[PDB]
Design a protein around this ligand. Structure first.
Ligand SMILES: C[S@@+](CC[C@H](N)C(=O)[O-])C[C@H]1O[C@@H](n2cnc3c(N)ncnc32)[C@H](O)[C@@H]1O
Ligand SMILES: C[S@@+](CC[C@H](N)C(=O)[O-])C[C@H]1O[C@@H](n2cnc3c(N)ncnc32)[C@H](O)[C@@H]1O
Lengths: 222, 228
């Protein structure tokens, strides 16, 4: 009976790899990836030759191979699979079929940003992406506006300015927010301020919203 | 001016440390640790000879801030997993941030996330709740405050309180709420078992081994019910 390995990958820095990750990737019969080409680049950097299987169900196909006794590693493009990344259907399928699922610890952008924010982390909520539509986004924000826990959002560069102005609008312009940009890359920048002043600070320079970002929002006073 | 590095460490398997963590732990002037003896043992496995600083005080945060300002680089670690995630360091990071000191987080092991990735529950959104109160009365109140939460919930629980805690979860959340018990992740006794919580509680009681070691609880969020 085969096993499924969940294997987190770097989020922009290739030294953020672990030895057990490299050993699992090289040992499994098959690697199910989000994008076979991103992962191929990654594998070639570490001198690992492996069979890739694209993850565009397909769960049932991979399930059969596991029952045939094949070991499978699930990876995503960056970070930890199933955290706003594919694989939720496969793990469900495998688990009720009695397939052992083995998670490797590794990089996760949300936790990485939270560890550097200087905000209360005894409790937090992970919200993923805000809605793209301005109305739907203001409604998600009103929905959590009272939440006392630290909130973590993933946000896109094109939508940051609009998201931030809505946040000012709904949560108020003195709500402390930490913007974590391009974690573990050369450009890495983490800056926190009252969200009013943060929005002002971001607009001063266009580059301050370039690349991948996480927002850490302080929770309501309570 | 020096920088403050936030450095995750293994949660039971030495091959889970990142290569960059090893690089940083060997390059900084000082390692500030939750427990210098526990950290000493980890460093020893990797041949690393380092200067350790005990965090056991905004007083000590002021000490470290001073070193950073005179140009010293500092790494912060906890006994396991990611610092600040139910581990000290929060005030130090804050103090450094408001003084212009750059904080550099390294990604790495975190038990909550590791468990979540393999639990088979919705992770589109989730709540990290940490440790439930140790006393049953306190614990039941904390559970009542989140009974209606629709997001997947994550809890840390101790081996000595798991059976009591599971009894209170049955009682407050109901015996059918799906819960996953992730035990001894990355260790040789690793076991991830999910079930309606009343069944989970019974399953655990069959064999005392099933509650030994370190554990995460992944709890299915609340679904709407007519009985209300
Ligand atoms: C679809 S998600 C993948 C999340 C990933 N699986 C993880 O482990 O967090 C991609 C989003 O994560 C966040 N992210 C990923 N890498 C990042 C980095 N290096 N710095 C800041 N945010 C990052 C960004 O918000 C980006 O839009
Ligand atoms: C105070 S916390 C430290 C959390 C750590 N900072 C992290 O990022 O995961 C310790 C608790 O985390 C959970 N934990 C740590 N290691 C674990 C493992 N290998 N398997 C299951 N749970 C673990 C247990 O509930 C343990 O009592």
């Amino acid at each position: 009976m085969g096993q499924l390995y969940i294997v987190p990958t770097p989020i922009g820095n290739l030294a953020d790899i672990t030895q057990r990750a490299l050993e699992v990737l090289q040992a499994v019969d098959l690697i199910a990836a989000e994008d076979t080409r991103h992962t191929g680049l990654l594998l070639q950097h570490f001198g690992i030759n492996a069979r890739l299987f694209a993850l565009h169900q397909k769960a049932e196909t991979l399930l059969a191979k596991l029952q045939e006794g094949q070991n499978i590693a699930l990876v995503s493009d960056a970070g930890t699979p199933l955290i706003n990344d594919p694989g939720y259907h496969l793990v469900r399928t495998c688990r009720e079929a009695g397939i052992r699922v083995v998670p490797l610890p590794g990089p996760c952008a949300a936790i990485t940003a939270l560890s550097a924010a200087g905000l209360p982390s005894d409790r937090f909520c992970y919200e993923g992406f805000l809605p793209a539509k301005s109305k739907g986004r203001r409604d998600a924000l009103k929905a959590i506006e009272a939440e006392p826990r630290t909130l973590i959002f993933y946000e896109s560069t094109h939508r940051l300015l609009d998201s931030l102005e809505d946040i000012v609008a709904v949560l108020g312009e003195s709500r402390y927010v930490v913007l974590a940009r391009e974690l573990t890359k050369t450009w890495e920048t983490i800056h926190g301020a009252p969200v009013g002043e943060l929005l002002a600070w971001v607009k001063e320079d266009e580059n301050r919203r370039k690349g991948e970002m996480v927002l850490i929002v302080e929770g309501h006073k309570a």
